[PDB]
Amino acid sequence: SEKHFKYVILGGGVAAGYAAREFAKQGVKPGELAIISKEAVAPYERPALSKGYLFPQNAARLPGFHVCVGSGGERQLPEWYSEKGIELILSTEIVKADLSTKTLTSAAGATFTYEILIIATGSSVIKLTDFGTQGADSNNILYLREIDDADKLVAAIQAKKGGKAVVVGGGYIGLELSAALKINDFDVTMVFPEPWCMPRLFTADIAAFYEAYYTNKGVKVLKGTLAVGFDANANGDVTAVKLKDGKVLEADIVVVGVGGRPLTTLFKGQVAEEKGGIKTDAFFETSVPGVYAIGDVATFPLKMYNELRRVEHVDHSRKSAEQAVKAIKGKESGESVPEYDYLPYFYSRSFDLGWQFYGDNVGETILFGDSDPTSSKPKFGSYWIKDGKVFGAFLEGGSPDENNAIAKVAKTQPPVASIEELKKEGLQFASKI
Ligand SMILES: Cc1cc2nc3c(=O)[nH]c(=O)nc-3n(C[C@H](O)[C@H](O)[C@H](O)COP(=O)(O)OP(=O)(O)OC[C@H]3O[C@@H](n4cnc5c(N)ncnc54)[C@H](O)[C@@H]3O)c2cc1C
Ligand SMILES: NC(=O)c1ccc[n+]([C@@H]2O[C@H](COP(=O)([O-])OP(=O)(O)OC[C@H]3O[C@@H](n4cnc5c(N)ncnc54)[C@H](O)[C@@H]3O)[C@@H](O)[C@H]2O)c1
C-alpha cells in the first residue's frame, strides 16, 4: 500500500509542472518521480483562470492550457507523465508531512515516501470568512485560485446572467475579474479602500489610466470603501454587499480578490521560515537537506537586490522550478549550478489591454507615451529611478521587442543623469540600450 519514489514534488501547480519538464530533460527514469496534487487535473497555466477561462465564447479550457504552453513550451497532458513513468497522483491532499522520516500522508490515510522532496504547494486564497466578516459565508460569494473555483465562477456567471456583480478587491485579480464579469454582460461594481487600483505596483498616474478605461467600459470603480458584511436570502444566497460608508450594493454574485498566503502549514517547525515563506538558498534548498521549496512558498535570495524576497509571479514559478531540479541533479553528478539570478517580471491582461513590469518599483517615477484611455492602441510606460539609475520599468501595449527592451533596462540599470530628459526620451530610451 505505501508508495516509494526517489523524488516527490508536493503540489500540482505551475512550479510542479515545470519541475517535471526539467526532470525529463535531466533524464528522469520510469518509477523515479511522483507529483502528488489535491486537484483532479495535470498541472496547468494558472494565470489563464482569470483571463481566457472566463470568456463567454471560445473560452480557454483544459487540456488546452496545461503547462508548458504559457511560456511557449510543449503541452504536458496526463499522457505526457504516464508515458514517461512520472507518477501523477491526483485528487490527493497531503494532510501530514514528516520530514525526519521522509513520509507524507494523504487525507485518506495513504502514505508516500521520498528521497528528495520538492515543496510546490503555492498559495491558499484569503477569504472574507477568515476575517469573520458578517454574512461572508453566503452562497455566490466566490474566489479564484484553482480550476474548480473557475468552474464554480463560470457556472455562477451563467446562472446569474445579466445580473449584478460586486468585485471585492482592487489588485490585479480584482481588475481581471471586473473586466471578465463585464465582458460576460454583468452590471459590475469594483470595491477597494486604497486611493488607487493595483496599489502595490501602480503609481497614481498609471492607476488613473486603468480606472478611466474601466469606467469607459461600464465598470463602476468605488475606491476608498470596504465590504464589511453581506445580506442573504432564505436559500443562503448573497443578495447585497454592505460597505463601511453605509452604502449597500445589490449583488447577484460577489467575486473576491483579497490576496493569498503561502501554503506552508505542513512544514511549520520542521523548516526555517522568513518573510512569510519557507527560507531557501540560491538553489531552493530549505534548512533540511534534500527538501526544496519552489514557486510561491519560497523566500529566496534575490541576487540582483542583495536581499531575501518572496514573489507571486508565474515567471518565478517556472524558473525556480527549473533551478531546483538543476540543483538536485547537479548534486547527484557533482556538477556545479550557478546561483538563481531572477529579474522580477510580472504581467496582467484584461479587456484589450496587456502590461508588463520588470525590476523593482522603488525611487522616483515618470510616466511616458500615449496614456489616453480612448486611444485605439494605448502604448505608455513608466520608469522608477533609484540612486540615479533605472530600477523599474513598466509598459502597457508594448510589442515583444519593446517588452524585451524594458526588461534589459531593468536588468542593466542604466544611469539617469536627468529625470526630465528621461521622460522626454520615453520608450526610445529602452530601445537605445
Ligand atoms: C487566477 C490567477 C491568475 C494569475 N495571473 C497571473 C498573471 O497574470 N501573471 C503572473 O505572473 N502570475 C499570475 N498569477 C500567479 C501565479 O499563477 C502563481 O505565482 C503560480 O501559480 C505559483 O506557482 P506555484 O506552483 O508556486 O503555485 P500553485 O500554481 O498554486 O501550485 C500549488 C499546487 O499545490 C497543490 N497543493 C497545495 N497544498 C497541497 C497539499 N497539502 N496536498 C496536495 N496538493 C497541495 C495545489 O492544489 C496546487 O496544485 C495568477 C494566479 C491566479 C490564482
Ligand atoms: N502581486 C502582488 O503584489 C500580490 C499581492 C498579494 C497577493 N497576490 C496573489 O496574486 C493573486 C492576486 O492578488 P491581488 O494582487 O489581487 O491582491 P492584493 O493583495 O494586491 O489586494 C487585495 C485587495 O483586496 C482589498 N480588500 C481587502 N479587504 C477588503 C474588503 N473587505 N473590501 C474591499 N476590498 C478589500 C485590498 O485592500 C486590496 O485592494 C492572488 O491569487 C494572491 O495569491 C499578489
Coordinates of C-alpha atoms and ligand atoms in Angstrom, one line a residue:
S1 CA 0.0 0.0 0.0
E2 CA 2.7 2.7 0.9
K3 CA 4.3 4.1 -2.2
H4 CA 8.0 5.0 -2.6
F5 CA 9.7 7.3 -5.1
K6 CA 13.3 8.7 -5.4
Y7 CA 11.8 12.2 -5.9
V8 CA 8.4 13.6 -4.8
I9 CA 7.1 17.1 -5.9
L10 CA 4.3 18.0 -3.4
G11 CA 1.7 20.0 -5.4
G12 CA 0.5 20.1 -9.0
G13 CA 0.8 23.7 -10.0
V14 CA 3.0 25.8 -12.3
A15 CA 6.2 25.1 -10.3
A16 CA 5.3 21.3 -10.2
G17 CA 4.6 21.1 -13.9
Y18 CA 7.8 22.9 -14.9
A19 CA 10.0 20.9 -12.4
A20 CA 8.6 17.7 -14.2
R21 CA 9.7 19.2 -17.6
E22 CA 13.2 19.9 -16.1
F23 CA 13.3 16.2 -14.7
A24 CA 12.6 14.7 -18.2
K25 CA 15.3 17.0 -19.7
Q26 CA 17.7 15.8 -16.9
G27 CA 16.9 12.1 -17.8
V28 CA 14.4 11.1 -15.1
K29 CA 13.7 7.4 -15.2
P30 CA 10.3 5.5 -15.0
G31 CA 9.2 5.0 -11.5
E32 CA 11.5 7.6 -10.0
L33 CA 9.3 10.7 -9.8
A34 CA 5.8 11.4 -8.4
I35 CA 3.7 14.5 -8.3
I36 CA 1.0 14.5 -5.6
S37 CA -1.7 17.1 -6.2
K38 CA -5.1 17.7 -4.5
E39 CA -6.5 18.9 -7.9
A40 CA -8.1 16.4 -10.3
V41 CA -6.1 17.6 -13.3
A42 CA -2.5 17.6 -14.6
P43 CA -0.5 20.9 -13.9
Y44 CA -1.9 23.9 -15.9
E45 CA -1.1 27.6 -16.5
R46 CA -2.9 29.2 -13.5
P47 CA -2.9 32.8 -15.0
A48 CA -5.5 31.6 -17.6
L49 CA -8.1 31.2 -14.9
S50 CA -8.8 35.0 -14.5
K51 CA -8.3 35.5 -18.3
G52 CA -9.5 33.3 -21.2
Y53 CA -11.2 30.7 -18.9
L54 CA -13.8 33.3 -18.1
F55 CA -14.7 34.2 -21.8
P56 CA -18.4 33.9 -22.7
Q57 CA -17.4 32.5 -26.1
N58 CA -14.4 30.4 -27.2
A59 CA -13.0 30.2 -23.6
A60 CA -9.7 28.6 -22.6
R61 CA -10.4 25.0 -21.4
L62 CA -8.3 22.0 -20.4
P63 CA -6.4 20.3 -21.9
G64 CA -5.6 23.4 -23.9
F65 CA -3.6 25.3 -21.2
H66 CA -1.8 22.5 -19.4
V67 CA 2.0 23.6 -18.7
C68 CA 4.2 24.4 -20.5
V69 CA 2.2 26.2 -23.2
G70 CA 2.0 29.5 -21.3
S71 CA 5.8 30.0 -21.8
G72 CA 5.8 28.6 -25.4
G73 CA 6.6 25.0 -24.3
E74 CA 5.0 21.7 -25.2
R75 CA 1.7 20.8 -23.6
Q76 CA 2.1 18.2 -20.8
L77 CA -1.2 16.2 -20.9
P78 CA -1.8 13.3 -18.3
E79 CA -0.3 11.1 -21.1
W80 CA 3.0 13.0 -21.1
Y81 CA 3.6 12.0 -17.4
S82 CA 2.3 8.3 -17.6
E83 CA 4.3 7.7 -20.9
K84 CA 7.5 8.9 -19.2
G85 CA 7.0 6.9 -16.0
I86 CA 6.2 10.0 -14.0
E87 CA 3.5 9.1 -11.5
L88 CA 0.8 11.7 -11.4
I89 CA -1.1 11.2 -8.1
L90 CA -4.3 13.3 -8.5
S91 CA -7.2 14.3 -6.1
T92 CA -4.8 13.6 -3.2
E93 CA -4.4 16.2 -0.4
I94 CA -1.4 15.6 1.8
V95 CA -2.5 16.4 5.4
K96 CA 0.7 15.5 7.1
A97 CA 4.4 15.8 6.2
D98 CA 7.1 14.2 8.4
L99 CA 10.4 15.3 7.0
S100 CA 12.5 13.3 9.5
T101 CA 11.1 10.0 8.3
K102 CA 10.6 11.3 4.7
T103 CA 6.9 10.3 4.8
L104 CA 3.8 12.1 3.5
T105 CA 0.2 11.1 4.5
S106 CA -2.9 11.7 2.3
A107 CA -6.3 12.7 3.7
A108 CA -7.4 9.1 3.0
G109 CA -4.5 7.8 5.3
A110 CA -2.4 6.6 2.3
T111 CA 1.4 7.1 2.9
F112 CA 4.2 8.0 0.4
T113 CA 8.0 8.1 0.9
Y114 CA 10.6 10.1 -1.0
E115 CA 14.4 10.6 -1.0
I116 CA 14.1 14.2 -2.3
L117 CA 11.1 16.5 -1.6
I118 CA 10.1 19.4 -3.8
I119 CA 7.6 21.7 -2.0
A120 CA 5.4 23.3 -4.6
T121 CA 2.3 23.9 -2.6
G122 CA 1.8 27.6 -3.8
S123 CA -0.6 29.8 -2.0
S124 CA -4.1 29.5 -0.5
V125 CA -6.7 32.2 -1.3
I126 CA -7.6 34.6 1.5
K127 CA -11.3 34.6 2.2
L128 CA -13.6 37.2 3.9
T129 CA -14.8 34.4 6.2
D130 CA -11.1 34.2 7.6
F131 CA -11.7 37.8 8.8
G132 CA -15.0 36.7 10.4
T133 CA -17.0 39.1 8.1
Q134 CA -20.7 39.1 8.7
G135 CA -22.5 37.0 6.1
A136 CA -19.4 36.2 4.1
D137 CA -20.3 32.5 4.1
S138 CA -23.4 33.3 1.8
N139 CA -23.6 31.3 -1.5
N140 CA -22.4 33.0 -4.7
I141 CA -19.6 34.8 -2.7
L142 CA -16.8 33.3 -4.8
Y143 CA -12.9 33.2 -5.0
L144 CA -10.5 32.4 -7.9
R145 CA -7.3 30.3 -7.2
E146 CA -7.9 26.9 -8.8
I147 CA -9.8 25.3 -11.8
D148 CA -12.7 24.1 -9.5
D149 CA -13.1 27.7 -8.3
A150 CA -13.1 28.8 -12.0
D151 CA -15.7 26.2 -12.9
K152 CA -17.9 27.5 -10.0
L153 CA -17.5 31.0 -11.2
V154 CA -18.3 30.0 -14.9
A155 CA -21.4 28.3 -13.5
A156 CA -22.4 31.3 -11.5
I157 CA -21.9 33.8 -14.3
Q158 CA -24.3 31.5 -16.4
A159 CA -26.9 31.1 -13.6
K160 CA -26.9 34.8 -12.7
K161 CA -26.7 36.1 -16.4
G162 CA -27.4 39.8 -16.9
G163 CA -27.4 40.4 -13.1
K164 CA -25.3 42.5 -10.7
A165 CA -21.8 41.6 -9.7
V166 CA -19.7 43.1 -6.9
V167 CA -15.9 42.6 -7.1
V168 CA -14.2 43.0 -3.7
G169 CA -10.6 44.0 -4.1
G170 CA -8.5 46.4 -6.1
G171 CA -5.4 44.3 -7.0
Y172 CA -4.8 42.8 -10.5
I173 CA -7.2 39.9 -9.7
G174 CA -10.0 42.4 -8.9
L175 CA -9.2 44.1 -12.1
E176 CA -9.1 40.9 -14.2
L177 CA -12.3 39.7 -12.5
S178 CA -14.1 43.0 -13.1
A179 CA -13.1 43.0 -16.7
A180 CA -14.3 39.4 -17.1
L181 CA -17.6 40.0 -15.4
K182 CA -18.2 43.0 -17.7
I183 CA -17.3 41.1 -20.9
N184 CA -19.9 38.5 -19.6
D185 CA -22.6 41.2 -19.6
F186 CA -22.8 41.9 -15.8
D187 CA -23.5 45.2 -14.2
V188 CA -20.1 45.4 -12.4
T189 CA -19.0 47.4 -9.3
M190 CA -15.5 47.1 -8.0
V191 CA -14.9 47.9 -4.2
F192 CA -11.4 48.6 -2.6
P193 CA -10.1 51.1 0.1
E194 CA -6.8 52.2 -1.4
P195 CA -6.6 55.6 -3.1
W196 CA -6.0 53.9 -6.5
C197 CA -6.0 50.3 -8.1
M198 CA -3.1 47.9 -8.0
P199 CA -1.6 49.8 -5.0
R200 CA 1.5 47.6 -4.6
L201 CA 2.8 48.5 -8.1
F202 CA 0.8 51.2 -10.0
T203 CA 1.6 54.8 -9.3
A204 CA -1.3 57.3 -9.1
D205 CA -0.7 58.1 -12.8
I206 CA -0.7 54.5 -14.1
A207 CA -3.8 53.8 -12.0
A208 CA -5.7 56.8 -13.4
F209 CA -5.4 55.3 -16.9
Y210 CA -6.9 51.8 -15.9
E211 CA -9.6 53.4 -13.7
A212 CA -10.7 55.7 -16.6
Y213 CA -10.5 52.8 -19.1
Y214 CA -12.7 50.5 -16.8
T215 CA -15.1 53.4 -16.3
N216 CA -15.5 53.9 -20.1
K217 CA -16.1 50.1 -20.3
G218 CA -19.1 50.4 -17.8
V219 CA -17.3 49.2 -14.7
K220 CA -18.1 51.2 -11.5
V221 CA -14.9 51.8 -9.6
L222 CA -15.6 52.5 -5.9
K223 CA -12.3 53.4 -4.3
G224 CA -12.0 54.4 -0.6
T225 CA -14.5 51.9 0.7
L226 CA -14.5 48.4 2.1
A227 CA -17.0 45.5 2.2
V228 CA -18.0 44.9 5.9
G229 CA -20.9 42.4 5.5
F230 CA -23.5 40.8 3.3
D231 CA -27.2 40.3 3.1
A232 CA -28.6 36.9 2.0
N233 CA -32.0 35.4 1.1
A234 CA -33.8 32.2 2.5
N235 CA -31.6 29.9 0.4
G236 CA -28.5 31.5 1.9
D237 CA -27.6 33.2 -1.4
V238 CA -25.9 36.6 -1.4
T239 CA -28.3 39.5 -2.1
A240 CA -26.3 42.6 -1.2
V241 CA -22.8 43.9 -0.1
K242 CA -22.7 46.3 2.9
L243 CA -19.9 48.8 2.8
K244 CA -18.1 50.7 5.6
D245 CA -19.5 54.0 4.4
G246 CA -23.1 52.8 4.8
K247 CA -23.8 52.2 1.1
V248 CA -25.5 48.8 0.3
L249 CA -24.8 47.4 -3.1
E250 CA -27.3 44.9 -4.6
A251 CA -25.5 41.8 -5.8
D252 CA -26.4 38.5 -7.6
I253 CA -22.8 37.3 -7.4
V254 CA -19.8 38.6 -5.4
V255 CA -16.3 37.7 -6.6
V256 CA -13.4 38.4 -4.1
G257 CA -9.8 39.2 -4.9
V258 CA -8.3 39.9 -1.5
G259 CA -4.9 38.1 -1.8
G260 CA -3.2 34.9 -0.8
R261 CA -0.7 33.4 1.5
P262 CA 2.0 30.7 1.1
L263 CA 0.6 27.2 1.9
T264 CA 3.4 26.1 4.3
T265 CA 1.2 24.7 7.3
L266 CA 2.5 21.1 6.7
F267 CA 6.1 22.3 7.5
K268 CA 5.7 24.8 10.4
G269 CA 8.6 24.0 12.8
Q270 CA 10.3 21.5 10.5
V271 CA 11.7 24.2 8.2
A272 CA 13.1 27.6 8.7
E273 CA 10.7 30.5 7.7
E274 CA 11.3 34.1 6.8
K275 CA 9.2 36.8 5.3
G276 CA 6.0 34.6 5.1
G277 CA 7.6 31.7 3.3
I278 CA 9.9 28.8 3.7
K279 CA 13.6 30.1 3.6
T280 CA 15.8 28.7 0.8
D281 CA 19.4 29.2 -0.5
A282 CA 20.2 30.3 -4.2
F283 CA 19.3 26.7 -5.2
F284 CA 15.8 26.5 -3.5
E285 CA 17.1 24.1 -0.8
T286 CA 15.4 24.5 2.6
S287 CA 17.2 24.2 6.1
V288 CA 16.5 20.4 5.7
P289 CA 18.9 18.6 3.2
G290 CA 17.1 17.1 0.2
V291 CA 14.0 19.2 0.8
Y292 CA 13.4 22.0 -1.7
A293 CA 10.9 24.9 -1.8
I294 CA 9.9 26.5 -5.1
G295 CA 7.3 29.0 -6.6
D296 CA 5.1 31.0 -4.2
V297 CA 6.3 29.4 -0.9
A298 CA 9.9 30.2 -1.4
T299 CA 11.7 33.1 0.4
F300 CA 14.9 33.0 -1.6
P301 CA 17.9 35.2 -2.2
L302 CA 17.1 37.9 -4.8
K303 CA 20.6 38.1 -6.2
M304 CA 20.4 41.5 -8.0
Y305 CA 18.9 43.3 -5.0
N306 CA 21.1 41.5 -2.4
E307 CA 18.2 40.6 -0.1
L308 CA 15.8 37.6 0.6
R309 CA 12.5 38.0 -1.2
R310 CA 9.2 36.2 -1.7
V311 CA 7.3 36.7 -5.0
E312 CA 4.0 35.5 -6.6
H313 CA 4.9 35.6 -10.2
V314 CA 4.3 32.8 -12.8
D315 CA 7.8 33.5 -14.3
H316 CA 9.4 32.8 -10.9
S317 CA 7.3 29.6 -10.5
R318 CA 8.6 28.3 -13.8
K319 CA 12.3 29.5 -13.3
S320 CA 12.6 28.5 -9.6
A321 CA 11.2 25.0 -10.6
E322 CA 14.0 24.6 -13.2
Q323 CA 16.7 25.9 -10.8
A324 CA 15.7 23.3 -8.1
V325 CA 15.9 20.2 -10.4
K326 CA 19.2 21.5 -11.8
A327 CA 20.5 21.8 -8.2
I328 CA 19.2 18.2 -7.3
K329 CA 20.6 16.6 -10.4
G330 CA 23.9 18.6 -10.2
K331 CA 24.5 17.3 -6.6
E332 CA 24.0 13.7 -7.9
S333 CA 26.6 14.3 -10.7
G334 CA 29.0 16.6 -8.7
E335 CA 28.3 19.3 -11.4
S336 CA 28.2 23.0 -10.3
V337 CA 25.0 25.0 -10.8
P338 CA 25.0 28.9 -10.8
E339 CA 23.0 30.9 -8.3
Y340 CA 19.4 31.8 -9.1
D341 CA 19.5 35.2 -10.7
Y342 CA 15.9 36.2 -11.1
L343 CA 14.8 39.5 -12.6
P344 CA 11.3 40.3 -11.2
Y345 CA 8.8 40.1 -14.1
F346 CA 5.1 40.4 -13.6
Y347 CA 2.2 41.0 -16.1
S348 CA -1.6 41.4 -16.4
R349 CA -4.2 41.5 -19.2
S350 CA -7.8 42.4 -19.3
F351 CA -10.2 43.9 -21.9
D352 CA -7.9 44.7 -24.9
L353 CA -5.0 45.8 -22.5
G354 CA -1.8 44.0 -21.6
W355 CA 1.0 45.3 -19.4
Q356 CA 4.4 44.0 -18.2
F357 CA 6.6 45.1 -15.3
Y358 CA 10.3 44.3 -14.8
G359 CA 12.7 45.1 -11.9
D360 CA 11.9 46.9 -8.7
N361 CA 9.3 49.6 -8.1
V362 CA 11.5 51.9 -5.9
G363 CA 12.6 55.5 -6.3
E364 CA 11.1 58.4 -8.2
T365 CA 8.7 57.8 -11.2
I366 CA 8.0 59.3 -14.6
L367 CA 5.2 58.5 -17.0
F368 CA 5.7 58.5 -20.8
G369 CA 3.9 57.8 -24.0
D370 CA 0.3 57.8 -25.0
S371 CA -1.8 57.4 -21.8
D372 CA -5.1 58.4 -23.3
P373 CA -7.7 55.7 -22.4
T374 CA -9.7 56.5 -25.5
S375 CA -6.7 55.6 -27.9
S376 CA -7.3 52.6 -30.1
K377 CA -4.0 51.1 -29.1
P378 CA -2.7 52.7 -25.8
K379 CA 1.1 52.5 -25.5
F380 CA 2.5 54.0 -22.4
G381 CA 5.1 53.2 -19.7
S382 CA 6.7 54.3 -16.6
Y383 CA 10.3 54.2 -15.1
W384 CA 11.4 54.0 -11.4
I385 CA 14.7 55.9 -10.6
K386 CA 16.7 54.9 -7.5
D387 CA 20.3 56.0 -6.8
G388 CA 20.5 57.7 -10.2
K389 CA 19.7 54.5 -12.2
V390 CA 16.6 52.9 -13.7
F391 CA 15.4 50.3 -11.2
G392 CA 11.9 49.6 -12.6
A393 CA 10.2 49.6 -15.9
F394 CA 6.5 49.3 -16.8
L395 CA 5.0 49.1 -20.3
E396 CA 1.3 48.9 -21.4
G397 CA 0.7 47.8 -25.0
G398 CA 4.3 47.0 -25.9
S399 CA 5.5 44.8 -28.8
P400 CA 7.6 41.7 -27.9
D401 CA 10.7 43.8 -28.8
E402 CA 9.6 46.8 -26.8
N403 CA 8.9 44.5 -23.8
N404 CA 12.3 42.8 -24.2
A405 CA 13.9 46.3 -24.3
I406 CA 12.4 47.4 -20.9
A407 CA 13.5 44.0 -19.4
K408 CA 17.1 44.8 -20.5
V409 CA 16.7 48.3 -19.0
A410 CA 15.5 46.8 -15.6
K411 CA 18.3 44.1 -15.7
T412 CA 21.1 46.5 -16.6
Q413 CA 20.0 49.6 -14.5
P414 CA 21.3 52.3 -16.9
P415 CA 22.3 55.7 -15.5
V416 CA 19.9 58.6 -15.4
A417 CA 21.6 62.0 -15.3
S418 CA 18.3 63.8 -15.9
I419 CA 14.8 62.5 -15.0
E420 CA 13.2 65.3 -17.2
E421 CA 15.3 64.2 -20.2
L422 CA 14.5 60.5 -19.4
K423 CA 10.7 61.3 -19.7
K424 CA 11.4 63.2 -23.0
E425 CA 13.2 60.1 -24.4
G426 CA 10.4 57.7 -23.2
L427 CA 10.2 54.3 -24.8
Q428 CA 13.1 55.3 -27.2
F429 CA 15.4 55.2 -24.2
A430 CA 14.8 51.4 -23.7
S431 CA 15.4 50.7 -27.4
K432 CA 18.6 52.8 -27.4
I433 CA 20.1 50.3 -24.8
Ligands
LIG1 C1 -6.3 33.4 -11.1 C2 -4.8 33.7 -11.0 C3 -4.3 34.5 -12.0 C4 -2.9 34.8 -12.0 N1 -2.4 35.6 -13.0 C5 -1.1 35.8 -13.0 C6 -0.6 36.6 -14.1 O1 -1.2 37.2 -14.9 N2 0.8 36.8 -14.1 C7 1.7 36.2 -13.1 O2 2.9 36.4 -13.2 N3 1.2 35.5 -12.1 C8 -0.2 35.3 -12.1 N4 -0.7 34.5 -11.1 C9 0.2 33.9 -10.0 C10 0.8 32.6 -10.5 O3 -0.1 31.8 -11.2 C11 1.4 31.9 -9.3 O4 2.5 32.6 -8.8 C12 1.8 30.4 -9.6 O5 0.7 29.7 -9.9 C13 2.6 29.8 -8.4 O6 3.1 28.6 -8.9 P1 3.2 27.5 -7.7 O7 3.5 26.2 -8.2 O8 4.1 28.0 -6.6 O9 1.7 27.6 -7.1 P2 0.3 26.9 -7.5 O10 0.2 27.1 -9.0 O11 -0.8 27.4 -6.7 O12 0.5 25.3 -7.2 C14 0.2 24.8 -5.9 C15 -0.3 23.4 -6.1 O13 -0.1 22.6 -4.9 C16 -1.3 22.0 -4.6 N5 -1.3 21.8 -3.1 C17 -1.3 22.7 -2.1 N6 -1.2 22.2 -0.9 C18 -1.3 20.8 -1.1 C19 -1.4 19.7 -0.2 N7 -1.3 19.8 1.1 N8 -1.5 18.5 -0.8 C20 -1.6 18.4 -2.1 N9 -1.5 19.3 -3.0 C21 -1.4 20.5 -2.5 C22 -2.4 23.0 -5.1 O14 -3.7 22.4 -5.2 C23 -1.8 23.3 -6.4 O15 -2.0 22.2 -7.4 C24 -2.1 34.2 -11.0 C25 -2.6 33.4 -10.0 C26 -4.0 33.2 -10.0 C27 -4.6 32.5 -8.8
LIG2 N1 1.3 40.7 -7.0 C1 1.1 41.0 -5.7 O1 1.6 42.1 -5.3 C2 0.2 40.2 -4.9 C3 0.0 40.5 -3.5 C4 -0.9 39.7 -2.8 C5 -1.4 38.6 -3.3 N2 -1.1 38.3 -4.6 C6 -1.5 36.9 -5.2 O2 -1.8 37.0 -6.5 C7 -3.2 36.9 -6.7 C8 -3.8 38.3 -6.9 O3 -4.0 39.0 -5.6 P1 -4.2 40.6 -5.8 O4 -3.0 41.2 -6.4 O5 -5.5 40.9 -6.4 O6 -4.3 41.0 -4.2 P2 -3.8 42.3 -3.4 O7 -3.1 41.8 -2.0 O8 -2.8 43.1 -4.1 O9 -5.1 43.1 -3.0 C9 -6.3 42.6 -2.3 C10 -7.2 43.8 -2.4 O10 -8.4 43.5 -1.7 C11 -8.7 44.7 -0.9 N3 -9.6 44.4 0.2 C12 -9.3 43.7 1.3 N4 -10.3 43.6 2.2 C13 -11.3 44.2 1.5 C14 -12.7 44.4 1.9 N5 -13.2 44.0 3.0 N6 -13.4 45.2 1.0 C15 -12.9 45.6 -0.1 N7 -11.6 45.5 -0.6 C16 -10.9 44.7 0.3 C17 -7.4 45.2 -0.6 O11 -7.4 46.5 0.0 C18 -6.7 45.1 -1.9 O12 -7.1 46.1 -2.8 C19 -3.8 36.1 -5.6 O13 -4.0 34.8 -6.0 C20 -2.7 36.2 -4.5 O14 -2.3 34.9 -4.0 C21 -0.4 39.0 -5.4

